[PDB]
Amino acid sequence: VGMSLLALISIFASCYMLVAARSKCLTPYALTPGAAVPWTLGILCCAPRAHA
Amino acid sequence: GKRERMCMKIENDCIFEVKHEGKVTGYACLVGDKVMKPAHVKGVIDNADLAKLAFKKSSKYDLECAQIPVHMRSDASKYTHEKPEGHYNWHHGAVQYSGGRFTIPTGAGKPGDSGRPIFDNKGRVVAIVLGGANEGSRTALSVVTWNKDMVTRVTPEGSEEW
Amino acid sequence: GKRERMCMKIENDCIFEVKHEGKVTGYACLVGDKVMKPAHVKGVIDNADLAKLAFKKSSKYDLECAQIPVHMRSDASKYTHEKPEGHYNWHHGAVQYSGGRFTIPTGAGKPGDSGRPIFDNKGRVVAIVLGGANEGSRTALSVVTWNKDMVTRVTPEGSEEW
């Protein structure tokens, strides 16, 4: 149970960082403009999961 | 004296006079299918369309972007990503944009009125007020601008929340 | 009052009144060797050169590209890739291009008239209407623009087919 609980917490933490990184890098591009470098800089920088 | 027939009178309604517990504390505006509203301020968003909308609260930019409906897309205000250094239009006065620094006449304006959708001399938007720094020389102010694509921000040293 | 001598009258026939069952539902125009036609609308393309032509139906852009022969290039319409945000020409009225947003007066125009090849104040074509959006105060619409090379599209939230 301890090993499984540790495994989940790290996965949850890792998922937590990924979403946070998406928010930090997506908010600047999407404040006034809809412009997100169609996956040229959408993949390397952060999550390209923005709709656009 | 009376040379004021610019976009301020044309739009006249993008200001939503954000009011916390009924006390006007900030001013929200709109730019290109988006809604601008300082994050550090708070209050009422009475407009039902805007009231039920989710904003970001990035402190690095201290802005509340949005996706406004078509209910404002004609009650809007054009913008710019370029700054022809000089004089720009303001609500409570004027804007004196020195080389890479915003400022207003010393003691002019007031604090607790963040939004203030500063206007350009062409009848468009180039800046939004965030703060104010009253140095011995004159009054600077923290504001937000827009690069080619990046929506950046500037905060001069000694500037407090306004 | 009378200040309409722009490209609208110069061409006067790029517009073809696409008719479904004889009912005009949309409009087809011509732009630099190409023929534009909204995808989501349908009807009659009676003009023989355009009647027997094959279009794409990319709903992501909701257009019908094409190639126009030489004999009809005499009836053409110049275009632009750059948008000087401001006022532009229209068939049913005017065009207030706010910051990255097409719009027209509240209740102006009508639905079921998608195409409407919006014209530039210089006598050119800068936008084709697709949809329309009439919420509380005023009106927006869904249209197509052209970037440096790529042909994009914009659709304001809450916009219905017009």
Short mmCIF file of C-alpha atoms in Angstrom, two decimals:
data_model
loop_
_atom_site.label_atom_id
_atom_site.label_comp_id
_atom_site.label_asym_id
_atom_site.label_seq_id
_atom_site.Cartn_x
_atom_site.Cartn_y
_atom_site.Cartn_z
CA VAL A 1 0.00 0.00 0.00
CA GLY A 2 2.85 2.38 0.79
CA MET A 3 4.57 1.83 -2.55
CA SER A 4 1.30 2.17 -4.46
CA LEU A 5 0.40 5.35 -2.58
CA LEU A 6 3.83 6.84 -3.33
CA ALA A 7 3.45 5.89 -6.99
CA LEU A 8 0.10 7.68 -7.25
CA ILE A 9 1.30 10.82 -5.46
CA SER A 10 4.25 11.23 -7.83
CA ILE A 11 1.95 10.68 -10.81
CA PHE A 12 -0.52 13.21 -9.41
CA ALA A 13 2.32 15.65 -8.76
CA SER A 14 3.65 15.12 -12.29
CA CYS A 15 0.19 15.69 -13.74
CA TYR A 16 -0.11 18.76 -11.51
CA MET A 17 3.09 20.29 -12.90
CA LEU A 18 2.05 19.62 -16.51
CA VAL A 19 -1.24 21.50 -16.13
CA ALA A 20 0.47 24.34 -14.26
CA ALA A 21 3.07 24.68 -17.02
CA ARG A 22 0.23 24.79 -19.54
CA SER A 23 -1.47 27.62 -17.64
CA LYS A 24 1.72 29.66 -17.25
CA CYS A 25 2.72 29.35 -20.92
CA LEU A 26 -0.79 29.60 -22.41
CA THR A 27 -2.03 32.64 -20.48
CA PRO A 28 0.49 35.09 -22.05
CA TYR A 29 -0.31 34.13 -25.65
CA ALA A 30 -4.06 34.16 -24.97
CA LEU A 31 -4.77 37.47 -23.26
CA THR A 32 -5.66 39.84 -26.13
CA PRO A 33 -4.84 37.74 -29.22
CA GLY A 34 -5.72 34.33 -30.55
CA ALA A 35 -2.29 33.37 -31.88
CA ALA A 36 -0.37 30.25 -30.92
CA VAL A 37 2.19 29.44 -33.62
CA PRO A 38 0.35 26.47 -35.12
CA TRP A 39 2.18 23.75 -33.20
CA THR A 40 5.57 25.06 -34.33
CA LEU A 41 6.00 26.67 -30.90
CA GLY A 42 2.91 24.96 -29.45
CA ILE A 43 4.71 21.65 -28.88
CA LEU A 44 8.20 22.68 -27.79
CA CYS A 45 7.05 25.35 -25.32
CA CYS A 46 4.03 23.92 -23.49
CA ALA A 47 0.78 22.02 -24.02
CA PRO A 48 -0.60 22.76 -27.53
CA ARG A 49 -4.00 21.59 -26.28
CA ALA A 50 -5.45 25.08 -26.80
CA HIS A 51 -8.46 24.94 -29.12
CA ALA A 52 -7.74 27.85 -31.47
CA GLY B 1 -9.61 73.57 -25.28
CA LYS B 2 -12.51 71.48 -26.60
CA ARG B 3 -10.62 69.08 -28.87
CA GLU B 4 -12.15 65.92 -27.35
CA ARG B 5 -14.21 64.03 -29.93
CA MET B 6 -12.08 60.89 -29.93
CA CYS B 7 -13.00 57.23 -29.43
CA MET B 8 -13.71 57.89 -25.74
CA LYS B 9 -17.06 59.42 -26.70
CA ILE B 10 -17.52 56.90 -29.53
CA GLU B 11 -17.38 53.85 -27.25
CA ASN B 12 -18.27 55.46 -23.88
CA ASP B 13 -19.44 52.12 -22.43
CA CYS B 14 -16.53 49.64 -22.34
CA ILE B 15 -15.90 50.88 -18.78
CA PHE B 16 -17.77 48.56 -16.40
CA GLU B 17 -16.84 50.38 -13.15
CA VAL B 18 -16.02 47.27 -11.14
CA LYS B 19 -17.53 47.83 -7.70
CA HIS B 20 -16.64 45.79 -4.62
CA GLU B 21 -19.56 45.62 -2.18
CA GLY B 22 -20.94 48.50 -4.24
CA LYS B 23 -17.72 50.55 -4.04
CA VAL B 24 -16.20 51.23 -7.46
CA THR B 25 -12.62 49.96 -7.18
CA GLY B 26 -11.60 49.24 -10.78
CA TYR B 27 -12.60 49.50 -14.44
CA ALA B 28 -12.97 46.65 -16.93
CA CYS B 29 -12.71 47.08 -20.70
CA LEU B 30 -12.72 44.93 -23.85
CA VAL B 31 -10.16 44.35 -26.59
CA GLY B 32 -10.47 42.06 -29.61
CA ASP B 33 -12.94 39.41 -28.42
CA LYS B 34 -11.31 39.56 -24.96
CA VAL B 35 -12.11 41.33 -21.69
CA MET B 36 -9.38 43.16 -19.76
CA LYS B 37 -9.67 43.47 -15.99
CA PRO B 38 -6.85 43.76 -13.41
CA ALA B 39 -6.47 40.64 -11.29
CA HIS B 40 -5.32 42.39 -8.11
CA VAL B 41 -8.54 44.41 -7.98
CA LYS B 42 -11.87 42.78 -7.19
CA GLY B 43 -15.53 43.70 -7.12
CA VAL B 44 -18.86 43.28 -8.88
CA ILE B 45 -19.07 42.25 -12.54
CA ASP B 46 -22.78 43.10 -12.59
CA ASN B 47 -23.05 42.69 -16.36
CA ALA B 48 -24.58 39.22 -16.53
CA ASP B 49 -22.60 38.27 -19.64
CA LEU B 50 -19.32 39.20 -17.94
CA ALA B 51 -20.42 38.16 -14.45
CA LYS B 52 -20.61 34.44 -15.30
CA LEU B 53 -17.26 34.29 -17.14
CA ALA B 54 -14.02 32.70 -15.94
CA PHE B 55 -10.81 34.76 -15.87
CA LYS B 56 -7.17 33.92 -15.31
CA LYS B 57 -5.40 35.50 -12.33
CA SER B 58 -1.74 35.37 -13.37
CA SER B 59 0.00 37.68 -10.90
CA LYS B 60 2.98 38.01 -13.25
CA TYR B 61 0.59 39.93 -15.52
CA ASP B 62 -2.16 40.76 -12.99
CA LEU B 63 -4.75 40.54 -15.77
CA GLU B 64 -8.13 38.85 -16.26
CA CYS B 65 -8.45 37.79 -19.89
CA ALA B 66 -11.73 36.38 -21.20
CA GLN B 67 -13.74 35.33 -24.26
CA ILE B 68 -16.49 37.95 -24.55
CA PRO B 69 -19.67 37.12 -26.53
CA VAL B 70 -21.00 39.11 -29.49
CA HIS B 71 -22.92 41.22 -26.96
CA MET B 72 -19.90 43.58 -26.77
CA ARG B 73 -18.20 42.88 -30.12
CA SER B 74 -19.60 46.19 -31.36
CA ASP B 75 -19.30 47.89 -27.95
CA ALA B 76 -15.55 47.30 -28.23
CA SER B 77 -12.31 49.28 -28.40
CA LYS B 78 -9.52 48.75 -30.91
CA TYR B 79 -5.98 48.19 -29.65
CA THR B 80 -2.36 48.29 -30.79
CA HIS B 81 0.83 46.27 -30.44
CA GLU B 82 2.97 49.34 -31.22
CA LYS B 83 3.69 52.49 -29.21
CA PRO B 84 4.43 55.75 -31.08
CA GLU B 85 6.17 57.38 -28.12
CA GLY B 86 4.45 60.63 -27.19
CA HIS B 87 1.04 61.78 -25.96
CA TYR B 88 -1.95 59.47 -25.54
CA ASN B 89 -5.54 60.04 -24.46
CA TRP B 90 -6.67 59.43 -20.88
CA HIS B 91 -9.88 59.54 -18.84
CA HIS B 92 -8.90 61.67 -15.83
CA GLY B 93 -6.35 63.69 -17.80
CA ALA B 94 -3.70 62.86 -20.40
CA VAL B 95 -0.89 60.35 -20.94
CA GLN B 96 2.73 61.46 -21.35
CA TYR B 97 4.70 58.49 -22.70
CA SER B 98 8.36 59.40 -22.43
CA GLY B 99 11.01 57.15 -23.91
CA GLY B 100 10.03 53.70 -22.68
CA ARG B 101 8.14 54.96 -19.63
CA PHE B 102 4.55 55.97 -18.94
CA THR B 103 3.83 58.97 -16.72
CA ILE B 104 1.15 61.52 -15.87
CA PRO B 105 1.33 65.00 -14.34
CA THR B 106 2.53 64.90 -10.75
CA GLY B 107 -0.35 64.43 -8.33
CA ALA B 108 -2.82 63.92 -11.18
CA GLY B 109 -5.27 61.04 -11.24
CA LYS B 110 -5.71 58.98 -8.09
CA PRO B 111 -5.13 55.51 -6.59
CA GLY B 112 -7.66 52.72 -6.33
CA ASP B 113 -8.75 53.16 -9.97
CA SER B 114 -6.66 50.49 -11.69
CA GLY B 115 -8.36 49.92 -15.03
CA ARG B 116 -8.51 53.29 -16.82
CA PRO B 117 -8.37 52.10 -20.45
CA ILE B 118 -5.84 54.68 -21.60
CA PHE B 119 -6.51 55.78 -25.18
CA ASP B 120 -4.26 56.76 -28.07
CA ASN B 121 -4.34 60.01 -30.03
CA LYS B 122 -5.71 58.09 -33.04
CA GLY B 123 -8.77 56.90 -31.11
CA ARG B 124 -7.50 53.46 -30.09
CA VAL B 125 -6.11 51.60 -27.07
CA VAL B 126 -2.42 51.13 -26.32
CA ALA B 127 -2.22 50.73 -22.52
CA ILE B 128 -4.18 49.94 -19.37
CA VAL B 129 -3.35 51.49 -16.00
CA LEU B 130 -2.30 49.26 -13.11
CA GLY B 131 -0.38 51.36 -10.58
CA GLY B 132 1.29 54.70 -9.90
CA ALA B 133 4.72 55.89 -8.74
CA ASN B 134 4.98 59.47 -7.46
CA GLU B 135 8.67 60.29 -7.61
CA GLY B 136 10.05 63.69 -6.70
CA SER B 137 10.20 64.53 -10.40
CA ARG B 138 6.85 63.28 -11.72
CA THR B 139 4.36 60.41 -11.55
CA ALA B 140 5.10 57.07 -13.22
CA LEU B 141 2.70 54.13 -13.23
CA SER B 142 2.60 50.37 -13.66
CA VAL B 143 0.71 49.42 -16.83
CA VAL B 144 0.26 46.57 -19.32
CA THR B 145 1.19 46.64 -23.00
CA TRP B 146 1.11 44.20 -25.92
CA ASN B 147 4.13 43.04 -27.91
CA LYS B 148 3.85 41.61 -31.43
CA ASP B 149 2.23 38.50 -29.92
CA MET B 150 3.26 38.44 -26.25
CA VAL B 151 0.96 40.25 -23.82
CA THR B 152 3.62 41.65 -21.50
CA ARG B 153 3.55 44.09 -18.58
CA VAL B 154 5.69 46.88 -17.11
CA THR B 155 5.90 48.04 -13.49
CA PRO B 156 8.23 50.99 -12.75
CA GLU B 157 10.14 50.90 -9.49
CA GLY B 158 8.39 52.51 -6.54
CA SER B 159 4.96 52.07 -8.14
CA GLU B 160 2.10 51.10 -5.81
CA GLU B 161 -1.32 49.67 -6.61
CA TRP B 162 -3.63 52.35 -8.03
CA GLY C 1 -24.92 61.33 -47.97
CA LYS C 2 -23.83 60.21 -51.44
CA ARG C 3 -20.24 58.97 -51.07
CA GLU C 4 -20.54 55.54 -52.72
CA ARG C 5 -18.42 55.29 -55.88
CA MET C 6 -16.18 52.47 -54.67
CA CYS C 7 -15.33 49.06 -56.13
CA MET C 8 -18.89 47.89 -55.40
CA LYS C 9 -20.17 49.76 -58.46
CA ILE C 10 -16.96 49.21 -60.45
CA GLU C 11 -17.47 45.43 -60.46
CA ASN C 12 -21.24 45.26 -59.77
CA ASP C 13 -21.37 41.63 -61.02
CA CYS C 14 -18.85 39.57 -59.02
CA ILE C 15 -21.89 38.75 -56.89
CA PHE C 16 -24.04 35.96 -58.32
CA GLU C 17 -26.94 35.27 -55.90
CA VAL C 18 -26.53 31.55 -55.30
CA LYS C 19 -30.10 30.18 -55.33
CA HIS C 20 -31.38 26.96 -53.76
CA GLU C 21 -34.59 25.91 -55.54
CA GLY C 22 -34.46 29.44 -56.96
CA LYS C 23 -34.29 30.92 -53.44
CA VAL C 24 -31.20 33.12 -53.08
CA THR C 25 -29.48 31.78 -49.95
CA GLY C 26 -25.91 33.08 -50.33
CA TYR C 27 -23.53 34.92 -52.64
CA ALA C 28 -20.48 33.96 -54.71
CA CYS C 29 -17.64 36.36 -55.54
CA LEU C 30 -14.35 36.35 -57.43
CA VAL C 31 -10.91 37.19 -56.04
CA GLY C 32 -7.64 37.15 -57.98
CA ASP C 33 -8.24 34.17 -60.31
CA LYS C 34 -10.24 32.35 -57.60
CA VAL C 35 -13.97 32.04 -56.89
CA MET C 36 -15.20 32.18 -53.29
CA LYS C 37 -18.42 30.57 -52.10
CA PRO C 38 -19.54 29.74 -48.53
CA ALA C 39 -19.55 26.00 -47.91
CA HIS C 40 -22.44 25.79 -45.44
CA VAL C 41 -24.80 27.41 -47.97
CA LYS C 42 -26.00 25.68 -51.13
CA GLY C 43 -28.05 26.37 -54.22
CA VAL C 44 -27.68 27.25 -57.91
CA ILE C 45 -24.42 28.37 -59.53
CA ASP C 46 -26.19 28.94 -62.86
CA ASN C 47 -23.17 30.63 -64.45
CA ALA C 48 -21.81 27.84 -66.63
CA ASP C 49 -18.14 28.47 -65.83
CA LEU C 50 -18.93 28.25 -62.11
CA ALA C 51 -21.87 25.83 -62.39
CA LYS C 52 -19.70 22.87 -63.48
CA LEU C 53 -16.81 23.58 -61.09
CA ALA C 54 -15.57 21.42 -58.22
CA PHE C 55 -15.02 23.02 -54.80
CA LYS C 56 -13.50 21.89 -51.54
CA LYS C 57 -15.81 21.69 -48.52
CA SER C 58 -13.43 22.19 -45.59
CA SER C 59 -15.91 22.99 -42.83
CA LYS C 60 -12.95 24.13 -40.72
CA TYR C 61 -12.96 27.16 -43.04
CA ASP C 62 -16.50 26.85 -44.48
CA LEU C 63 -15.41 27.99 -47.93
CA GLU C 64 -15.50 26.62 -51.49
CA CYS C 65 -12.29 27.51 -53.30
CA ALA C 66 -12.12 27.31 -57.09
CA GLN C 67 -10.29 28.41 -60.23
CA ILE C 68 -11.87 31.01 -62.53
CA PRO C 69 -11.24 30.94 -66.31
CA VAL C 70 -9.68 33.81 -68.26
CA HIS C 71 -12.88 35.09 -69.87
CA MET C 72 -14.32 36.01 -66.45
CA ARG C 73 -11.07 37.42 -65.03
CA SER C 74 -12.11 40.64 -66.78
CA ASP C 75 -14.77 40.69 -64.03
CA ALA C 76 -12.48 40.35 -61.00
CA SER C 77 -12.07 41.90 -57.55
CA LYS C 78 -8.77 42.82 -55.93
CA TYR C 79 -8.07 41.87 -52.33
CA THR C 80 -5.76 42.45 -49.37
CA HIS C 81 -3.77 40.45 -46.83
CA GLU C 82 -3.43 43.35 -44.36
CA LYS C 83 -6.23 44.77 -42.21
CA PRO C 84 -6.08 48.50 -41.41
CA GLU C 85 -8.49 48.25 -38.48
CA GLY C 86 -11.27 50.78 -39.02
CA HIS C 87 -14.28 51.31 -41.26
CA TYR C 88 -14.85 49.30 -44.44
CA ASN C 89 -17.46 49.13 -47.18
CA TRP C 90 -20.52 46.88 -47.23
CA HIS C 91 -23.52 46.10 -49.42
CA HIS C 92 -26.25 46.47 -46.78
CA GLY C 93 -24.52 49.22 -44.76
CA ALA C 94 -21.11 49.89 -43.20
CA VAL C 95 -18.31 47.98 -41.47
CA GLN C 96 -16.88 48.89 -38.05
CA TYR C 97 -13.70 46.81 -37.85
CA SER C 98 -12.85 47.12 -34.19
CA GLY C 99 -9.71 45.50 -32.83
CA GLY C 100 -9.55 42.19 -34.67
CA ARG C 101 -13.35 42.08 -34.86
CA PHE C 102 -15.78 42.61 -37.70
CA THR C 103 -19.15 44.06 -36.69
CA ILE C 104 -22.16 45.98 -38.02
CA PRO C 105 -25.03 47.93 -36.40
CA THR C 106 -27.60 46.22 -34.19
CA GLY C 107 -30.16 44.44 -36.33
CA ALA C 108 -28.62 45.69 -39.57
CA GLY C 109 -28.51 43.32 -42.50
CA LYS C 110 -30.14 39.91 -42.20
CA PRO C 111 -29.43 36.17 -41.92
CA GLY C 112 -29.53 33.73 -44.81
CA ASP C 113 -27.18 36.04 -46.74
CA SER C 114 -23.84 34.48 -45.88
CA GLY C 115 -21.45 35.63 -48.59
CA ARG C 116 -21.64 39.45 -48.79
CA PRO C 117 -18.09 40.03 -50.12
CA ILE C 118 -17.30 42.94 -47.81
CA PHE C 119 -15.33 45.65 -49.60
CA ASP C 120 -12.43 47.84 -48.51
CA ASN C 121 -12.57 51.63 -48.24
CA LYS C 122 -9.86 51.68 -50.94
CA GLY C 123 -12.12 49.81 -53.37
CA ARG C 124 -11.03 46.21 -52.77
CA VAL C 125 -12.17 43.07 -50.92
CA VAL C 126 -10.88 42.35 -47.40
CA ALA C 127 -13.53 40.04 -45.93
CA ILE C 128 -16.37 37.69 -46.86
CA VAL C 129 -19.31 37.34 -44.47
CA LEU C 130 -20.20 33.86 -43.26
CA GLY C 131 -22.37 34.13 -40.17
CA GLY C 132 -23.99 36.67 -37.89
CA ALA C 133 -24.46 37.17 -34.18
CA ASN C 134 -27.09 39.43 -32.59
CA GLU C 135 -26.90 39.37 -28.80
CA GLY C 136 -28.27 41.94 -26.36
CA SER C 137 -26.80 45.30 -27.37
CA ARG C 138 -25.29 45.07 -30.86
CA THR C 139 -24.19 42.70 -33.62
CA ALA C 140 -21.11 40.67 -34.56
CA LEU C 141 -20.51 38.13 -37.32
CA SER C 142 -18.38 35.23 -38.50
CA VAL C 143 -16.17 36.01 -41.50
CA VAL C 144 -12.98 34.91 -43.28
CA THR C 145 -9.67 36.77 -43.53
CA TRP C 146 -6.35 36.03 -45.23
CA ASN C 147 -3.01 36.15 -43.42
CA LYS C 148 0.29 36.66 -45.25
CA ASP C 149 -0.27 33.36 -47.08
CA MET C 150 -2.64 31.17 -45.06
CA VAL C 151 -6.41 31.59 -45.43
CA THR C 152 -7.84 31.65 -41.91
CA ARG C 153 -11.34 32.18 -40.49
CA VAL C 154 -12.83 33.84 -37.41
CA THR C 155 -16.13 33.04 -35.68
CA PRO C 156 -17.20 35.06 -32.61
CA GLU C 157 -18.69 33.04 -29.77
CA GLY C 158 -22.45 32.67 -29.95
CA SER C 159 -22.63 33.44 -33.68
CA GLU C 160 -25.40 31.79 -35.71
CA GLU C 161 -25.43 31.07 -39.43
CA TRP C 162 -26.54 34.14 -41.39
#
